[PDB]
Amino acid sequence: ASKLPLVTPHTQCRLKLLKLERIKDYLLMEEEFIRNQEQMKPLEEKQEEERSKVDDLRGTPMSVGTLEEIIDDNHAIVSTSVGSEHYVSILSFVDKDLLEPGCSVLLNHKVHAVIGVLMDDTDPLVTVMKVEKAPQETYADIGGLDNQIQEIKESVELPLTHPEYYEEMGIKPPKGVILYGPPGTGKTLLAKAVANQTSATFLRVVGSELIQKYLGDGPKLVRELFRVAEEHAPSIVFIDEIDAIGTKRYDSNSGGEREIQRTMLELLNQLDGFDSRGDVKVIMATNRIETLDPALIRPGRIDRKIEFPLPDEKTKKRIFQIHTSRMTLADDVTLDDLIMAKDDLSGADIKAICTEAGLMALRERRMKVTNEDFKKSKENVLYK
Amino acid sequence: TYSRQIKQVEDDIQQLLKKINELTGIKESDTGLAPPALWDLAADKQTLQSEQPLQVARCTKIINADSEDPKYIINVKQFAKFVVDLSDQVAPTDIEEGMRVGVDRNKYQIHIPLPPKIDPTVTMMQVEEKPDVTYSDVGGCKEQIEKLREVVETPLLHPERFVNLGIEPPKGVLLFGPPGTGKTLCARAVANRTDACFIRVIGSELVQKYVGEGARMVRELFEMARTKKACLIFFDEIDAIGGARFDDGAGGDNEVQRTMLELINQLDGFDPRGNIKVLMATNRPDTLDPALMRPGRLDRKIEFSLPDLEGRTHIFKIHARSMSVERDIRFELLARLCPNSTGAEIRSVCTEAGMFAIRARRKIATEKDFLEAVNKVIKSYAKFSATPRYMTYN
Amino acid sequence: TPNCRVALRNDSYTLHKILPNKVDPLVSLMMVEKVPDSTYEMIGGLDKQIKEIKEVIELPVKHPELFEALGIAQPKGVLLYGPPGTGKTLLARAVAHHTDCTFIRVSGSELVQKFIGEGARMVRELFVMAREHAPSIIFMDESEVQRTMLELLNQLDGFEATKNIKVIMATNRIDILDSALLR
Amino acid sequence: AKEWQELDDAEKVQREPLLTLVKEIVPYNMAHNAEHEACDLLMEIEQVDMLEKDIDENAYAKVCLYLTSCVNYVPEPENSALLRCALGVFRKFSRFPEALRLALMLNDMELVEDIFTSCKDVVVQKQMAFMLGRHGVFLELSEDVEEYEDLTEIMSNVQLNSNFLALARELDIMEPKVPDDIYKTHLENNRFGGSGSQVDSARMNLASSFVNGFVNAAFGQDKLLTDDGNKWLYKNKDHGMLSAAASLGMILLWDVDGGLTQIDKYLYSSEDYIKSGALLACGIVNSGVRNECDPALALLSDYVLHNSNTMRLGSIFGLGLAYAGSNREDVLTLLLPVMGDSKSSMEVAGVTALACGMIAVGSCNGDVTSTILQTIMEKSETELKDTYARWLPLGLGLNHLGKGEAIEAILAALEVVSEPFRSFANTLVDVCAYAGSGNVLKVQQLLHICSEHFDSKEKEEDKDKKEKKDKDKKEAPADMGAHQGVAVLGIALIAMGEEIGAEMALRTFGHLLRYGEPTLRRAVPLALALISVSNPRLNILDTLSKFSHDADPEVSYNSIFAMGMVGSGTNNARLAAMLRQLAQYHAKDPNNLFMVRLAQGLTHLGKGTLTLCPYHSDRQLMSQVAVAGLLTVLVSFLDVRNIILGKSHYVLYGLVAAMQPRMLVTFDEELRPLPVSVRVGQAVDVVGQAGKPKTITGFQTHTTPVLLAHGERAELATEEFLP
Amino acid sequence: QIHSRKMNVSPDVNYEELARCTDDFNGAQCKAVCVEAGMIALRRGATELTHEDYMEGILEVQAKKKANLQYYA
Numbered sequence A: 001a002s003k004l005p006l007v008t009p010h011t012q013c014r015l016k017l018l019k020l021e022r023i024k025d026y027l028l029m030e031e032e033f034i035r036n037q038e039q040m041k042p043l044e045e046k047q048e049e050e051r052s053k054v055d056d057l058r059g060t061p062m063s064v065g066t067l068e069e070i071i072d073d074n075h076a077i078v079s080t081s082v083g084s085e086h087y088v089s090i091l092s093f094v095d096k097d098l099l100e101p102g103c104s105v106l107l108n109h110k111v112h113a114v115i116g117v118l119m120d121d122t123d124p125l126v127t128v129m130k131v132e133k134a135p136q137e138t139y140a141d142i143g144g145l146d147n148q149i150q151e152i153k154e155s156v157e158l159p160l161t162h163p164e165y166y167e168e169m170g171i172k173p174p175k176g177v178i179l180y181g182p183p184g185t186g187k188t189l190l191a192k193a194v195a196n197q198t199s200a201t202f203l204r205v206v207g208s209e210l211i212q213k214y215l216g217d218g219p220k221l222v223r224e225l226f227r228v229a230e231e232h233a234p235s236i237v238f239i240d241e242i243d244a245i246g247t248k249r250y251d252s253n254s255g256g257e258r259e260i261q262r263t264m265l266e267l268l269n270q271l272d273g274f275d276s277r278g279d280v281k282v283i284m285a286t287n288r289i290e291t292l293d294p295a296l297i298r299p300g301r302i303d304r305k306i307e308f309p310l311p312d313e314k315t316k317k318r319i320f321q322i323h324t325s326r327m328t329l330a331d332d333v334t335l336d337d338l339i340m341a342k343d344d345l346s347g348a349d350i351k352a353i354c355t356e357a358g359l360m361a362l363r364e365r366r367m368k369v370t371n372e373d374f375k376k377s378k379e380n381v382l383y384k
Numbered sequence B: 001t002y003s004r005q006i007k008q009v010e011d012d013i014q015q016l017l018k019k020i021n022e023l024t025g026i027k028e029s030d031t032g033l034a035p036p037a038l039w040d041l042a043a044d045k046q047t048l049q050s051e052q053p054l055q056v057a058r059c060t061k062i063i064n065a066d067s068e069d070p071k072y073i074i075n076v077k078q079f080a081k082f083v084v085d086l087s088d089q090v091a092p093t094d095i096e097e098g099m100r101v102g103v104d105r106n107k108y109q110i111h112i113p114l115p116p117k118i119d120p121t122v123t124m125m126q127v128e129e130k131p132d133v134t135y136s137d138v139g140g141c142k143e144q145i146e147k148l149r150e151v152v153e154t155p156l157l158h159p160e161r162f163v164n165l166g167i168e169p170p171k172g173v174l175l176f177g178p179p180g181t182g183k184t185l186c187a188r189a190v191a192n193r194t195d196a197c198f199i200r201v202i203g204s205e206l207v208q209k210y211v212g213e214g215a216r217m218v219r220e221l222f223e224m225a226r227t228k229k230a231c232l233i234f235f236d237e238i239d240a241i242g243g244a245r246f247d248d249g250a251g252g253d254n255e256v257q258r259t260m261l262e263l264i265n266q267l268d269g270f271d272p273r274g275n276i277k278v279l280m281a282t283n284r285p286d287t288l289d290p291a292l293m294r295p296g297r298l299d300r301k302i303e304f305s306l307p308d309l310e311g312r313t314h315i316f317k318i319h320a321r322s323m324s325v326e327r328d329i330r331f332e333l334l335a336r337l338c339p340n341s342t343g344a345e346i347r348s349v350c351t352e353a354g355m356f357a358i359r360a361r362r363k364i365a366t367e368k369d370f371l372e373a374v375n376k377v378i379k380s381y382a383k384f385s386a387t388p389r390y391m392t393y394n
Numbered sequence C: 001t002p003n004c005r006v007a008l009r010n011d012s013y014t015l016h017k018i019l020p021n022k023v024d025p026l027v028s029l030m031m032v033e034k035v036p037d038s039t040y041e042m043i044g045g046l047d048k049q050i051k052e053i054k055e056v057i058e059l060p061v062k063h064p065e066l067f068e069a070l071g072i073a074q075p076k077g078v079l080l081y082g083p084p085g086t087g088k089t090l091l092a093r094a095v096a097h098h099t100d101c102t103f104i105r106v107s108g109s110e111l112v113q114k115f116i117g118e119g120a121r122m123v124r125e126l127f128v129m130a131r132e133h134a135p136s137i138i139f140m141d142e143s144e145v146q147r148t149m150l151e152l153l154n155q156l157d158g159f160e161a162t163k164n165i166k167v168i169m170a171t172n173r174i175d176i177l178d179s180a181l182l183r
Numbered sequence D: 001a002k003e004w005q006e007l008d009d010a011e012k013v014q015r016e017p018l019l020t021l022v023k024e025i026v027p028y029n030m031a032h033n034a035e036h037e038a039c040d041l042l043m044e045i046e047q048v049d050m051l052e053k054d055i056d057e058n059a060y061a062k063v064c065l066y067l068t069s070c071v072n073y074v075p076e077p078e079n080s081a082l083l084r085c086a087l088g089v090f091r092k093f094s095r096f097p098e099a100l101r102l103a104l105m106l107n108d109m110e111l112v113e114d115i116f117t118s119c120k121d122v123v124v125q126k127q128m129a130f131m132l133g134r135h136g137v138f139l140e141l142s143e144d145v146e147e148y149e150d151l152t153e154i155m156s157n158v159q160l161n162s163n164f165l166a167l168a169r170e171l172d173i174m175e176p177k178v179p180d181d182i183y184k185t186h187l188e189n190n191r192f193g194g195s196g197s198q199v200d201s202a203r204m205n206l207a208s209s210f211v212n213g214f215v216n217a218a219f220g221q222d223k224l225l226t227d228d229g230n231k232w233l234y235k236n237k238d239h240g241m242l243s244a245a246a247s248l249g250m251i252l253l254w255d256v257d258g259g260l261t262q263i264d265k266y267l268y269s270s271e272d273y274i275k276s277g278a279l280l281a282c283g284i285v286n287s288g289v290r291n292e293c294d295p296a297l298a299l300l301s302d303y304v305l306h307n308s309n310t311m312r313l314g315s316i317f318g319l320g321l322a323y324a325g326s327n328r329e330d331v332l333t334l335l336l337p338v339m340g341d342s343k344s345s346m347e348v349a350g351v352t353a354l355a356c357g358m359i360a361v362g363s364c365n366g367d368v369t370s371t372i373l374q375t376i377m378e379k380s381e382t383e384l385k386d387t388y389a390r391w392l393p394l395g396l397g398l399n400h401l402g403k404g405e406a407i408e409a410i411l412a413a414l415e416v417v418s419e420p421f422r423s424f425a426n427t428l429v430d431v432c433a434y435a436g437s438g439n440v441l442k443v444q445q446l447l448h449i450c451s452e453h454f455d456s457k458e459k460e461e462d463k464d465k466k467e468k469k470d471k472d473k474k475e476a477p478a479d480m481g482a483h484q485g486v487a488v489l490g491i492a493l494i495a496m497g498e499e500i501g502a503e504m505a506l507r508t509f510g511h512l513l514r515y516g517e518p519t520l521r522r523a524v525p526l527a528l529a530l531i532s533v534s535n536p537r538l539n540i541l542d543t544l545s546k547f548s549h550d551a552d553p554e555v556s557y558n559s560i561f562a563m564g565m566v567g568s569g570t571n572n573a574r575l576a577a578m579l580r581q582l583a584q585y586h587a588k589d590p591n592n593l594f595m596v597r598l599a600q601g602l603t604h605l606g607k608g609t610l611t612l613c614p615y616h617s618d619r620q621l622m623s624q625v626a627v628a629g630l631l632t633v634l635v636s637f638l639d640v641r642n643i644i645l646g647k648s649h650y651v652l653y654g655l656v657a658a659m660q661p662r663m664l665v666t667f668d669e670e671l672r673p674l675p676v677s678v679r680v681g682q683a684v685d686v687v688g689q690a691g692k693p694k695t696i697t698g699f700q701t702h703t704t705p706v707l708l709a710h711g712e713r714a715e716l717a718t719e720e721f722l723p
Numbered sequence E: 001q002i003h004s005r006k007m008n009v010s011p012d013v014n015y016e017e018l019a020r021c022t023d024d025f026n027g028a029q030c031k032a033v034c035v036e037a038g039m040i041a042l043r044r045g046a047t048e049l050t051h052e053d054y055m056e057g058i059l060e061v062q063a064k065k066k067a068n069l070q071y072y073a
């Protein structure tokens, strides 16, 4: 295990033959040394004789307690599971490194001495926020933007996949990225393409669930979010619909607008605090960019500000080519009449028509979609 | 030539490492055990020494002593209160009242005094580790640094120039300006160079869920701070901890004002804090309370304004001293294009213009690579700008 | 099994015998709320809405392949609306009954809360019990509901990979609900 | 072999070392002479990558291969190329194994290529205090104007520029006249755990001399700030009256200007302990100056006082320290009748071999004659303590260090043919000649003779010393045996041994590195905070202070002040209150001045080892924490060739730099041009630090044309024929 | 006058003048002038205090905003 990290010649040289044959002698001499322990001092079997001695030391009932402090001369104040806490001692088979205040431990039943530590069963909120698998298809599913698809790779993908271009420049990557525009243009759609592509851990939270019903439970939820994001990996924190923290007032929140405010002060800390930040990239998205606090959008917290426009009428035709790719489309239809139907139909409307017109065909058990399917589709989707 | 011959002689000896380390004992990936050849000290001896002679000594809390006799009144977590006595191994000296002690399970007598409870959410806000911002990175505001550095560290590094002159130096200082100006940046340089404990407090951490729970956290801060010989408290974003008392009708934000009042009492009056120096940093000072803006608490009122011209030209030299540039560019021309800009924006210009070199192919930025960055950062992100409604501090 | 009772001796705390099957916490949740279990046989005169609700829910469970032949995304959310007392709850209870779906409804109550989680800082912790009874249906009554549904719809938009999970909202007066829900 | 450099000039050029070596492996010269002249006409850009491919193969080899391939390595920057400035530092590679005259014939080749001053200056910069000295008699030739008056400027004026390091540049960065506050950093144990004001031990005052002593290197001169060492100089502790006086030599280090003047204001006390510590400190101050201070002036006047204690003792240690870089035979014969006295002051006689072994590493077999006579006259007619064993054979390995020839093993092991307690010295001169190479056939005869044998308290000191000679051969195979040793000892000795591991085998890590990396920095306090109170527990408390042995200060105050917290009540102050603060004050000696780790340029030695290795032999084990080891525990290692490489040294000394510090390089054979190293994010211009794996390059089309390998005093000429 | 007791003050001070150029202060701010004036003399290295050291200490306690304002009168 991690015996030698040198692999650098990478050929059929004698140097690769020399190094590993040196290591061959460092292993056998270490083998033959430790072999002569049991030859002259048998004294045990050591596969079980030390083990069963430990297993007979530790009692068969094993109570579970809680750490709250350590005094490093192998005795610490531990809390029992009722609430009455003791001043028991710690053993030597305890590996006194995995002990934090709040870690669940194993105790003796007789004198309650700290026998072993317990691996924690965590968590019912990490698995909530952590995206399990890659969501959907690739960047080729998008179509039409092609100017900011370069931009997001520039700040997320390319700092991760090519860590040589910023070094030859002598620069650090831009920190924050926000995404804004009208509703239904592809803000949430682009973030799935990033989570398809990346090898980082990807955390998502919606801005509406940042507000809590108790006092101070809001800023506690933010502090432990960035704790989770930092403790894993190079990671990507995606916060969607963050204007919703300030627009909608809910009667669950006992603190009024001045509990929204204290949460945003904590969020204002966690992006550009004084603490050592680490490798965490922040992506944000909204559709009401003018409402939120300008102190949160200052450079240093969010560097890149990407606008999404409405789909142009030659980018619209590309979107119909995507959502009607794998459907058995009858040759009656003409897509170019469908394009200029609404003058500002978003990319969401195109999928809203193409999914609905397929639903009309299954009412009549058909397999191909005709023209009058689309004729009654935009009446159903748009006009109400 | 010897393609497989260097491979299989490599591969078996990498296996022969594993094939005999399984015959020593590091294996059986545990549920909380030790490495096997590390606990051998307590294998026979301290097994029957740290367990069989040694006892459990359940820990308690003492109410009071009484005269003429030991006769201590003790208290435990949920059970009763007892009348106890000492052991032979401790003097009756350091068994002073209101102190946690360990107590056997049969006779109920006191074994050893204990260090008190530290309330661990205050334990996590001691910094333990220093950041890497030097005063050489806070260029452009030298006069503000000098007027700050003479309060925080010069009575600590030389506590004799003041005493022989007979003056008591100031204690409190707040740092205020528009955002992105250098307040949190200049606070990191102080924790770089200093040597006392540097306990940081973000003002959004004192909002608690119960009533008066936020005010007890202020004390446990100032209890462990008085134990130290010198400590340096840092308050950040204190517009959340208290603006002003305005109580009207339905008592709203009454809870946060009591936390703001307990902080006021720990700063002045009645056997003061001693050698504790505080340091606030806010974004809008006009909301703050007049009894907190009073000197004797917040003596120094250092301003962080925008850089003038030579503040700006110095900041370009800081954030572009470490990047591959064309030799023949002038920074003084660039700082005339950013009239009311912050130091955080100037760093974003320098990082953006290095990206344009990465956009096409090249390895060193040009002067026109800078100018394509200025009109994007200064003039195309000017819809947001964050400054002009904070210059008036509203 | 995990989450199963046992007997236990007390001198050495040795495992004694398996003690049977106590309860699922999801079973206790619906037992508290007591939805009026219904069927198609007690539906009075709603023949066209039955044909509508089968196309969106009944078909993408028994025949998921039938949309791959048309190559569209399968639907996820249904909105039911009308004046109160016209059969919103019983129709949703009927559809989950006739294709063997765990009809879960949430009200945001707090007696319910102890079976989901200790604090449940999100609403999204409901999905752990939902992806264990995998062909399930989340139901919601009639502004805390309109924020609850947007949190549910965004998870099942591609970020959730488990299929066969649908949501149904029932409220009156659609012209006052959120425009973010009217995209 | 020409066909490989014929078709493409690809990385198949390094296949020609795979062709020239496999052909006639032992007679490599007959193939290399056919390939030297072929390479002299081959290319002048395809020199340097085959050059580093040779030193990659020359980093470790068979002895007859390391003999032959390193002298064929020499003329390729001389015959083919004339880069010619990497001669002196990289034929210190070739000085000891092949022939001591061969690099002296290359010292002649230095004095041949006399064009003109710039590369001429920088090559001979290192000849004084960077890998050896003893050269200051070869530059008084017939051209004594400036090019042969460089020698005086080589001797002490650039050493005064290395004083000017701490005079101007280190006062400017951080350093006040008294930092003093690491003692103040021992702050909160009075309030951590109730009350304080309890530790009243007198041995804490021995560590309280290092509130003064360790913090005041590099011109930390103190005027009435030595009052802790003044009032305790007249209070008690005779061996601390030696300590507070010898601590003043560390305070004025690398000095000739005022070091003798500061001693005399505290010298005149008429005490055996105060003077012989102050006069021992006089050899500390001029260490590396080797000018006219006292060849026989002051410390010879100290030594002739002798009928008694440390006047007899503390005078020979200072001169062997100050003249360790010398090879002067005369005062070696002034101090040879110290060995030839046969006066029964035994602790004087043990450091006698320790003083003379520091001077020479080659000839004068009459030293080896003089040592072994009193060895047989005293150690044969007894079977007693390691004061014989830790001291008297140790100067012999210093007199025969650094040659893998196995002739000195034939000479010395057949010389003390004796009983096995006198044949303790079997392994001393055996492997002290074998410092850095690859000779794993020695490593098997370093274990397999006496592996364990269960040895009922018989040669446990020998098998500790048998492992003591396993502590070299790991510092310079250039990381290759370094990972291959920490895999061994963590399973063999400290894990499943009886006495070699639990008492002594941690001292490899104080010899493998003062670098500091968390593989072994976290593997040691597993055996430390678990004290193992059952054994002679100062053995693990010996591993306390010399695990803090690693310089270049770190976050490791966390590891030590937490052990300083448990070290107050438990791990008692009666025998360790000196020691935990000796551990604490060691890493931050000053902020700077820590390059004591025997790797110069890239990897050559610069010993160094002669000044360091006696103390790692001195801690075996007990009884020298109070009386006898206080001569050694303060001022043993003093070859601190200080720190930095950021220096301009253009004639005016007006440039600063254009520098760029990085993680160490990884290139063996890659695409052209080869990327050097990868930690670009730091970029400096001035006297800032060196650090652990640092390769520093430049820019600005300055071309840095001086020496191009490394070597920390580049002349830094400039040239701009690139518009 | 009370908080000026432990400082070395030259007899060039006019507390009648100093109380009149300090309007609208409280007992904290009048205490805070004496400490800042006791520090300005340490900047220039002076030992005793003069009148202008108090006058410079007032301008720090008021905490004004310096903005290039000399285009009056």
Ligand SMILES: Nc1ncnc2c1ncn2[C@@H]1O[C@H](COP(=O)(O)OP(=O)(O)OP(=O)(O)O)[C@@H](O)[C@H]1O
Pocket: A141, A142, A143, A144, A145, A182, A183, A184, A185, A186, A187, A188, A189, A190, A287, A311, A319, A322, A346, A347, A348, A349, A351, C183
């Ligand atoms: N430019 C586009 N190209 C292809 N498909 C698109 C485009 N824009 C939108 N869509 C379709 O619209 C659906 C929803 O888009 P999305 O929700 O990402 O827009 P949005 O702006 O994030 O919405 P909101 O503003 O409500 O968050 C996506 O599933 C996608 O298939």
Ligand SMILES: Nc1ncnc2c1ncn2[C@@H]1O[C@H](COP(=O)(O)OP(=O)(O)OP(=O)(O)O)[C@@H](O)[C@H]1O
Pocket: A272, A295, A300, B137, B138, B139, B140, B141, B178, B179, B180, B181, B182, B183, B184, B185, B186, B283, B315, B318, B342, B343, B344, B347
């Ligand atoms: N004078 C300056 N010199 C160099 N860098 C600066 C300067 N001012 C700001 N910066 C840059 O600004 C960033 C830090 O800003 P800082 O967090 O201090 O803003 P602030 O004044 O605390 O306002 P906020 O509280 O909104 O953050 C750093 O990235 C730093 O490089």
Ligand SMILES: Nc1ncnc2c1ncn2[C@@H]1O[C@H](COP(=O)(O)OP(=O)(O)O)[C@@H](O)[C@H]1O
Pocket: C036, C042, C043, C044, C045, C046, C083, C084, C085, C086, C087, C088, C089, C090, C091, C170
């Ligand atoms: N169309 C219907 N057919 C039969 N029963 C109905 C119908 N509509 C309502 N009910 C009665 O109403 C009750 C269910 O309430 P419901 O109408 O579902 O509430 P909602 O207002 O949510 O739709 C049932 O007890 C049922 O007997």
Ligand SMILES: [Mg+2]
Pocket: A184, A187, A188, A189
């Ligand atoms: Mg969206």
Ligand SMILES: [Mg+2]
Pocket: A272, B180, B183, B184, B185
């Ligand atoms: Mg800030």
